[PDB]
Short mmCIF file of C-alpha atoms in Angstrom, two decimals:
data_model
loop_
_atom_site.label_atom_id
_atom_site.label_comp_id
_atom_site.label_asym_id
_atom_site.label_seq_id
_atom_site.Cartn_x
_atom_site.Cartn_y
_atom_site.Cartn_z
CA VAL A 1 23.08 19.56 -77.23
CA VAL A 2 24.32 19.28 -73.64
CA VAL A 3 22.41 17.36 -70.97
CA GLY A 4 19.41 19.13 -69.49
CA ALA A 5 19.70 20.96 -66.19
CA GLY A 6 18.82 19.13 -62.99
CA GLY A 7 21.54 16.53 -62.30
CA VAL A 8 22.34 16.23 -58.61
CA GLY A 9 25.62 17.28 -57.04
CA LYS A 10 28.48 15.03 -56.07
CA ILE B 1 50.00 15.14 -59.18
CA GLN B 2 51.59 17.75 -61.46
CA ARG B 3 52.59 17.15 -65.08
CA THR B 4 54.93 19.32 -67.13
CA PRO B 5 53.95 20.55 -70.62
CA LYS B 6 55.24 18.94 -73.79
CA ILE B 7 55.88 21.82 -76.17
CA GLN B 8 55.93 21.65 -79.97
CA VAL B 9 56.63 24.64 -82.22
CA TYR B 10 55.85 24.21 -85.90
CA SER B 11 54.24 25.73 -88.98
CA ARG B 12 50.79 24.81 -90.28
CA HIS B 13 52.13 24.25 -93.81
CA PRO B 14 55.63 23.16 -94.91
CA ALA B 15 57.71 26.28 -94.55
CA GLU B 16 58.83 28.28 -97.59
CA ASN B 17 60.53 31.62 -97.13
CA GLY B 18 58.43 34.58 -98.26
CA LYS B 19 55.09 32.70 -98.18
CA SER B 20 52.39 33.45 -95.63
CA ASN B 21 51.88 30.61 -93.17
CA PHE B 22 50.85 29.95 -89.56
CA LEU B 23 53.15 29.56 -86.54
CA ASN B 24 51.81 27.03 -84.00
CA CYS B 25 52.81 26.30 -80.41
CA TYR B 26 51.07 23.15 -79.15
CA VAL B 27 51.34 22.51 -75.39
CA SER B 28 49.98 19.21 -74.14
CA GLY B 29 50.23 16.75 -71.31
CA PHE B 30 50.17 19.33 -68.51
CA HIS B 31 48.37 19.62 -65.18
CA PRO B 32 47.19 21.85 -63.57
CA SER B 33 45.66 24.03 -66.29
CA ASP B 34 47.21 27.42 -65.42
CA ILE B 35 49.80 28.14 -68.10
CA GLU B 36 51.37 31.11 -69.88
CA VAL B 37 52.25 30.79 -73.56
CA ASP B 38 53.85 33.49 -75.71
CA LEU B 39 55.10 33.33 -79.27
CA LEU B 40 58.33 35.22 -79.84
CA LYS B 41 59.90 36.94 -82.85
CA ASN B 42 63.57 37.72 -82.20
CA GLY B 43 62.89 37.47 -78.48
CA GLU B 44 59.98 39.92 -78.74
CA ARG B 45 56.45 38.85 -77.82
CA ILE B 46 54.09 38.70 -80.79
CA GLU B 47 50.93 40.63 -79.92
CA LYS B 48 48.34 39.01 -82.21
CA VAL B 49 48.24 35.45 -80.87
CA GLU B 50 45.07 33.36 -80.71
CA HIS B 51 44.56 30.14 -78.81
CA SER B 52 42.16 27.19 -78.75
CA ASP B 53 39.68 26.48 -75.94
CA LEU B 54 41.13 24.38 -73.09
CA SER B 55 40.51 20.66 -73.58
CA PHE B 56 42.08 17.49 -72.29
CA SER B 57 43.15 13.97 -73.14
CA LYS B 58 42.19 10.50 -71.93
CA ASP B 59 44.70 10.71 -69.07
CA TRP B 60 43.08 14.09 -68.02
CA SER B 61 46.14 16.14 -69.03
CA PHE B 62 45.39 19.46 -70.75
CA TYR B 63 46.31 20.75 -74.21
CA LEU B 64 46.15 24.12 -75.96
CA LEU B 65 47.14 25.45 -79.39
CA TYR B 66 48.50 29.01 -79.69
CA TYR B 67 48.85 30.34 -83.21
CA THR B 68 49.58 33.42 -85.27
CA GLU B 69 49.88 34.28 -88.93
CA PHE B 70 53.48 34.83 -89.99
CA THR B 71 55.68 35.01 -93.08
CA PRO B 72 58.93 33.06 -92.52
CA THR B 73 62.35 34.45 -93.46
CA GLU B 74 65.95 33.30 -93.07
CA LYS B 75 67.01 35.69 -90.31
CA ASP B 76 63.86 35.92 -88.21
CA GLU B 77 64.01 33.73 -85.12
CA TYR B 78 60.73 32.37 -83.78
CA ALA B 79 60.14 30.66 -80.46
CA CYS B 80 57.46 29.66 -77.98
CA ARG B 81 57.88 30.65 -74.33
CA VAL B 82 55.92 28.60 -71.79
CA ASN B 83 55.58 29.09 -68.04
CA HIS B 84 53.97 26.51 -65.76
CA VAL B 85 54.12 25.62 -62.08
CA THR B 86 56.26 22.60 -62.96
CA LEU B 87 59.00 24.77 -64.54
CA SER B 88 61.91 26.32 -62.66
CA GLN B 89 61.97 29.07 -65.31
CA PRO B 90 59.92 29.79 -68.44
CA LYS B 91 60.92 27.28 -71.10
CA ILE B 92 61.79 28.65 -74.54
CA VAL B 93 61.48 26.31 -77.52
CA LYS B 94 62.87 27.70 -80.76
CA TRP B 95 61.11 26.90 -84.01
CA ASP B 96 63.14 24.33 -85.97
CA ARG B 97 61.91 23.63 -89.52
CA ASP B 98 62.81 19.92 -89.15
CA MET B 99 60.42 19.23 -86.27
CA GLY C 1 32.61 5.29 -90.61
CA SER C 2 31.60 5.82 -86.98
CA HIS C 3 31.08 9.22 -85.37
CA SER C 4 30.99 10.70 -81.89
CA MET C 5 29.59 13.68 -80.01
CA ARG C 6 31.57 14.68 -76.91
CA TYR C 7 31.40 17.55 -74.42
CA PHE C 8 34.43 18.45 -72.26
CA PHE C 9 34.06 20.53 -69.10
CA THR C 10 36.76 22.04 -66.87
CA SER C 11 36.08 23.97 -63.63
CA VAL C 12 39.07 25.46 -61.73
CA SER C 13 38.74 27.12 -58.34
CA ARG C 14 40.59 30.43 -57.92
CA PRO C 15 40.40 31.20 -54.20
CA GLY C 16 40.62 34.95 -53.66
CA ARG C 17 40.50 35.67 -57.41
CA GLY C 18 36.77 35.34 -58.04
CA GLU C 19 34.52 32.46 -58.96
CA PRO C 20 35.88 29.29 -60.56
CA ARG C 21 36.93 29.36 -64.18
CA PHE C 22 34.52 27.25 -66.29
CA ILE C 23 35.24 26.13 -69.88
CA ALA C 24 32.99 23.83 -71.91
CA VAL C 25 33.77 22.56 -75.41
CA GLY C 26 31.62 20.41 -77.71
CA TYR C 27 32.99 18.23 -80.52
CA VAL C 28 31.63 16.10 -83.30
CA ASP C 29 34.47 13.63 -83.99
CA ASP C 30 37.62 15.82 -83.79
CA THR C 31 35.83 19.01 -84.93
CA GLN C 32 34.93 21.57 -82.26
CA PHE C 33 31.49 23.10 -82.80
CA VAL C 34 30.51 24.99 -79.61
CA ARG C 35 32.15 26.54 -76.59
CA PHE C 36 31.34 28.30 -73.35
CA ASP C 37 33.96 30.20 -71.35
CA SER C 38 33.07 31.93 -68.10
CA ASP C 39 35.79 34.51 -68.69
CA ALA C 40 34.64 35.41 -72.20
CA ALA C 41 32.40 38.40 -72.92
CA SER C 42 29.12 36.90 -74.14
CA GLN C 43 28.27 34.51 -71.29
CA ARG C 44 26.52 32.44 -73.96
CA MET C 45 27.13 29.15 -75.64
CA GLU C 46 28.87 30.21 -78.90
CA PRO C 47 29.23 28.52 -82.29
CA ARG C 48 32.64 27.31 -83.41
CA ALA C 49 31.80 25.49 -86.66
CA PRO C 50 29.95 26.98 -89.64
CA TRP C 51 27.24 24.32 -89.81
CA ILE C 52 25.97 24.99 -86.25
CA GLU C 53 25.39 28.71 -86.83
CA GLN C 54 22.11 27.93 -88.63
CA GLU C 55 20.56 26.91 -85.28
CA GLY C 56 17.93 29.38 -84.07
CA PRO C 57 17.80 31.63 -81.03
CA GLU C 58 15.82 29.08 -78.99
CA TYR C 59 18.65 26.58 -79.55
CA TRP C 60 21.30 28.98 -78.21
CA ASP C 61 19.06 30.02 -75.29
CA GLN C 62 18.63 26.40 -74.19
CA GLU C 63 22.30 25.52 -74.65
CA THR C 64 23.34 28.59 -72.65
CA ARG C 65 20.90 27.83 -69.83
CA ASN C 66 21.88 24.18 -69.58
CA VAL C 67 25.63 24.71 -69.82
CA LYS C 68 25.47 27.41 -67.13
CA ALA C 69 23.57 24.92 -64.96
CA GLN C 70 26.46 22.49 -65.35
CA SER C 71 28.83 25.23 -64.17
CA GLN C 72 26.73 25.86 -61.08
CA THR C 73 26.76 22.18 -60.13
CA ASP C 74 30.52 22.04 -60.74
CA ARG C 75 31.09 25.04 -58.43
CA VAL C 76 29.09 23.31 -55.69
CA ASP C 77 31.00 20.07 -56.26
CA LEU C 78 34.37 21.82 -55.95
CA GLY C 79 33.43 22.66 -52.36
CA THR C 80 31.95 19.22 -51.71
CA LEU C 81 35.06 17.44 -52.95
CA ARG C 82 37.31 19.73 -50.90
CA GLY C 83 35.42 18.36 -47.91
CA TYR C 84 35.56 14.71 -48.97
CA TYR C 85 39.31 14.92 -49.53
CA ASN C 86 39.89 17.05 -46.39
CA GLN C 87 41.54 19.94 -48.20
CA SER C 88 41.83 23.59 -47.25
CA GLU C 89 39.97 26.51 -48.84
CA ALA C 90 43.27 28.10 -49.93
CA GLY C 91 44.32 25.81 -52.80
CA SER C 92 43.16 25.72 -56.42
CA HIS C 93 41.50 22.47 -57.55
CA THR C 94 40.06 21.11 -60.78
CA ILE C 95 37.00 19.15 -61.83
CA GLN C 96 37.00 17.70 -65.36
CA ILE C 97 34.04 15.99 -67.00
CA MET C 98 33.65 14.32 -70.36
CA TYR C 99 30.50 12.71 -71.72
CA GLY C 100 29.15 11.75 -75.11
CA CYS C 101 28.00 9.03 -77.45
CA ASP C 102 29.17 7.10 -80.52
CA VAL C 103 27.06 6.06 -83.51
CA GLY C 104 27.89 3.79 -86.42
CA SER C 105 27.97 4.73 -90.07
CA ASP C 106 24.29 3.73 -90.31
CA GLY C 107 23.54 6.05 -87.37
CA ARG C 108 22.86 3.31 -84.83
CA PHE C 109 23.86 3.86 -81.21
CA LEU C 110 27.18 2.21 -80.39
CA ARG C 111 28.03 3.41 -76.89
CA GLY C 112 27.69 6.22 -74.39
CA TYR C 113 29.99 7.39 -71.67
CA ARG C 114 30.60 9.80 -68.83
CA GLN C 115 33.84 10.20 -66.91
CA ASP C 116 34.65 12.62 -64.08
CA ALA C 117 38.02 13.59 -62.59
CA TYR C 118 39.28 15.59 -59.62
CA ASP C 119 42.73 17.24 -59.67
CA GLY C 120 43.62 15.31 -62.81
CA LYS C 121 42.83 11.82 -61.49
CA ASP C 122 39.87 9.51 -61.94
CA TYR C 123 36.97 10.29 -59.61
CA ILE C 124 33.84 8.47 -60.89
CA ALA C 125 32.78 6.92 -64.21
CA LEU C 126 29.58 5.52 -65.68
CA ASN C 127 30.04 1.89 -66.66
CA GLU C 128 29.58 0.57 -70.21
CA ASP C 129 26.08 -0.76 -69.45
CA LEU C 130 24.96 2.81 -68.55
CA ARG C 131 23.40 1.38 -65.37
CA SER C 132 26.11 1.43 -62.71
CA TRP C 133 29.07 3.54 -61.59
CA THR C 134 32.72 2.84 -60.74
CA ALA C 135 34.23 5.10 -58.09
CA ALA C 136 38.00 5.51 -58.02
CA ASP C 137 38.42 5.61 -54.23
CA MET C 138 36.49 5.75 -50.99
CA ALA C 139 35.70 9.47 -51.26
CA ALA C 140 34.15 9.02 -54.72
CA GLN C 141 32.03 6.17 -53.33
CA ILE C 142 30.13 8.83 -51.32
CA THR C 143 29.11 10.42 -54.63
CA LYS C 144 28.22 6.98 -56.04
CA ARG C 145 25.83 6.24 -53.16
CA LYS C 146 24.19 9.65 -53.71
CA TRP C 147 23.85 9.06 -57.43
CA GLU C 148 22.47 5.55 -56.88
CA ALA C 149 19.84 6.78 -54.44
CA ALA C 150 18.82 9.57 -56.84
CA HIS C 151 18.72 7.25 -59.89
CA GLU C 152 21.07 9.55 -61.77
CA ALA C 153 22.20 6.76 -64.10
CA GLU C 154 18.69 6.25 -65.49
CA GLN C 155 18.30 10.00 -66.11
CA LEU C 156 21.74 10.27 -67.74
CA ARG C 157 21.19 7.11 -69.83
CA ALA C 158 18.09 8.64 -71.43
CA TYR C 159 20.40 11.41 -72.67
CA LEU C 160 23.46 9.30 -73.59
CA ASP C 161 21.63 6.69 -75.64
CA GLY C 162 18.67 8.90 -76.64
CA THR C 163 19.01 12.71 -76.85
CA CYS C 164 22.75 12.56 -77.58
CA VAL C 165 22.21 10.16 -80.50
CA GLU C 166 19.31 12.18 -81.94
CA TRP C 167 21.30 15.42 -82.01
CA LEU C 168 24.55 13.81 -83.22
CA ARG C 169 22.52 12.47 -86.16
CA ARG C 170 21.11 15.97 -86.77
CA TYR C 171 24.58 17.58 -86.65
CA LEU C 172 26.05 14.98 -89.04
CA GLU C 173 23.31 15.86 -91.53
CA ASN C 174 23.65 19.59 -90.95
CA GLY C 175 27.44 19.44 -91.34
CA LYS C 176 27.62 16.65 -93.87
CA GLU C 177 29.52 18.78 -96.38
CA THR C 178 32.51 18.73 -93.95
CA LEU C 179 32.07 16.15 -91.14
CA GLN C 180 31.96 13.06 -93.40
CA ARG C 181 35.45 13.68 -94.89
CA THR C 182 38.40 11.41 -94.10
CA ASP C 183 41.76 12.89 -95.15
CA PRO C 184 44.44 10.17 -95.22
CA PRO C 185 47.99 11.08 -94.16
CA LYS C 186 50.58 12.42 -96.58
CA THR C 187 53.74 10.61 -95.51
CA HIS C 188 57.49 10.99 -95.99
CA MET C 189 60.81 10.43 -94.22
CA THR C 190 63.59 12.87 -93.34
CA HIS C 191 67.20 12.21 -92.38
CA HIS C 192 69.35 14.30 -90.03
CA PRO C 193 72.96 13.44 -89.15
CA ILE C 194 73.78 13.88 -85.47
CA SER C 195 77.49 13.10 -85.95
CA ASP C 196 79.80 11.48 -88.52
CA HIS C 197 78.47 8.03 -87.60
CA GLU C 198 74.79 8.46 -86.61
CA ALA C 199 71.63 10.03 -88.02
CA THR C 200 68.00 10.55 -87.03
CA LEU C 201 65.37 9.04 -89.31
CA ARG C 202 62.04 10.81 -88.83
CA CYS C 203 58.78 9.42 -90.23
CA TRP C 204 56.18 12.09 -90.98
CA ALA C 205 52.37 12.02 -91.28
CA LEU C 206 50.69 15.23 -92.35
CA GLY C 207 47.27 16.55 -93.25
CA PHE C 208 45.18 13.69 -91.86
CA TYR C 209 41.69 13.57 -90.34
CA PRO C 210 40.49 12.07 -88.03
CA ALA C 211 43.39 12.50 -85.58
CA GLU C 212 43.66 8.79 -84.72
CA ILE C 213 46.84 7.30 -86.25
CA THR C 214 49.65 4.81 -85.60
CA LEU C 215 53.33 5.34 -86.51
CA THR C 216 55.74 2.48 -85.81
CA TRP C 217 59.45 1.80 -86.45
CA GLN C 218 60.81 -1.66 -87.30
CA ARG C 219 64.43 -2.77 -87.70
CA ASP C 220 64.71 -5.90 -89.85
CA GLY C 221 61.04 -6.57 -89.04
CA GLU C 222 61.62 -6.37 -85.28
CA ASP C 223 59.83 -3.49 -83.58
CA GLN C 224 61.88 -0.74 -81.94
CA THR C 225 59.46 0.17 -79.17
CA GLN C 226 62.07 1.43 -76.71
CA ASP C 227 64.34 3.41 -79.07
CA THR C 228 61.56 5.37 -80.81
CA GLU C 229 60.81 9.01 -80.04
CA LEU C 230 57.11 9.69 -80.68
CA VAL C 231 55.54 13.15 -80.44
CA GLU C 232 51.94 13.81 -79.45
CA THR C 233 49.52 14.21 -82.35
CA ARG C 234 49.09 17.89 -83.02
CA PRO C 235 46.59 20.10 -84.87
CA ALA C 236 47.70 21.90 -88.01
CA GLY C 237 45.10 24.56 -87.26
CA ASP C 238 43.13 24.03 -90.48
CA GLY C 239 41.18 20.97 -89.34
CA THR C 240 43.89 18.37 -89.97
CA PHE C 241 46.51 16.79 -87.73
CA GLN C 242 50.23 15.98 -87.87
CA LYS C 243 52.51 13.45 -86.15
CA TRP C 244 56.06 12.16 -86.42
CA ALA C 245 58.13 9.30 -85.03
CA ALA C 246 61.93 9.10 -85.02
CA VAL C 247 64.79 6.66 -84.52
CA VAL C 248 68.56 7.20 -84.22
CA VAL C 249 70.41 4.84 -86.56
CA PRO C 250 74.04 4.06 -87.43
CA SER C 251 75.15 5.84 -90.58
CA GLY C 252 75.18 3.32 -93.42
CA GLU C 253 72.46 1.13 -91.87
CA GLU C 254 69.50 3.33 -92.84
CA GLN C 255 67.98 0.78 -95.19
CA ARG C 256 67.47 -1.69 -92.30
CA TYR C 257 64.63 0.46 -90.88
CA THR C 258 61.00 0.80 -91.90
CA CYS C 259 58.26 3.11 -90.67
CA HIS C 260 54.69 1.74 -90.75
CA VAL C 261 51.69 4.08 -90.94
CA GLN C 262 48.12 3.02 -90.09
CA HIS C 263 45.13 5.35 -90.49
CA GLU C 264 41.47 4.53 -91.10
CA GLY C 265 41.84 6.60 -94.28
CA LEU C 266 44.60 4.39 -95.75
CA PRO C 267 43.59 1.69 -98.26
CA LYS C 268 46.58 -0.33 -97.07
CA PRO C 269 49.09 0.37 -94.29
CA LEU C 270 52.06 2.32 -95.64
CA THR C 271 55.66 1.16 -95.35
CA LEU C 272 58.40 3.77 -95.72
CA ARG C 273 62.12 3.15 -96.21
CA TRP C 274 65.05 5.55 -96.57
CA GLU C 275 65.96 5.32 -100.27
CA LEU C 276 69.76 5.01 -100.01
CA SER C 277 71.54 4.94 -103.38
#
């Protein structure tokens, strides 16, 4: 599975 | 900043005239990702051509596999035609059974 | 043997031709098992290997939602990085991302990784310890400070050495009838005159899996690093790979050359010689 949503932008 | 495609044209299985097989055109090492790839039979675009999903290598250059089912003969001439921003004209690579 | 789970993401801006193109691919080892393509019809994560199709609708719903969330962040970042690198709105640009994890043959975590690129060059990478980042230049350091302040590494680590490992182990069990195979290379040499006095010797490796392999040419035991033509490893299209390496030799001197083949699937490294009579 891919990482869960919610990582912050660059 | 821009990298030209390395183009390989080959069959999935060792080629034997008459026998169904698969014609592959593998394009790798290119950047940016926009590319046009056609497989040719006697200079004529083959219409049923599938391709892999865009992926890339450790150096970030892209690669794609285009492929079609074909039955090789002696007279039929097969090639891969590739266009890319790095090319002055679309590059045609003929299928050579030794490569 | 060891195994990996890797996801590859590409986002390409298309100014004046709609929203950026987004393509995501998931692999176990060298076998693709899922994909998402913003230009395809379904707008879902889709199966690409037989053993993943048994996952239920809640699996595909979650994968679709989370991979679309990655595409949204990537679209935002394309504009952010345009600003950091002081580029115009007119050009097309690319973000590439790869992340994943490796486990050993006993299933233990070996390593996790995440690497990001912009226009085909390094941008930022997670370090081996999964705790710190390395930025490629001063623009990427802006991202690094943001990610430090937001403790992104700790959040990502919990995936890379936790969730990633758990699901890779599940997939290896679910696909065991096909992912545990190692096909060693079928090897041979060919010989092609280029004139009356010279010929190409080509060393072939066919039908192997995984794709990792080494082909090397020696003359009298001395390596021929600079006179060897080596093609990129290529897929056969049936799950195996092919490679060749070639050297131009003087006619009559063929037997002075040897091709050496190394592949995890080979009991011993192979040595090949042209069998002149």
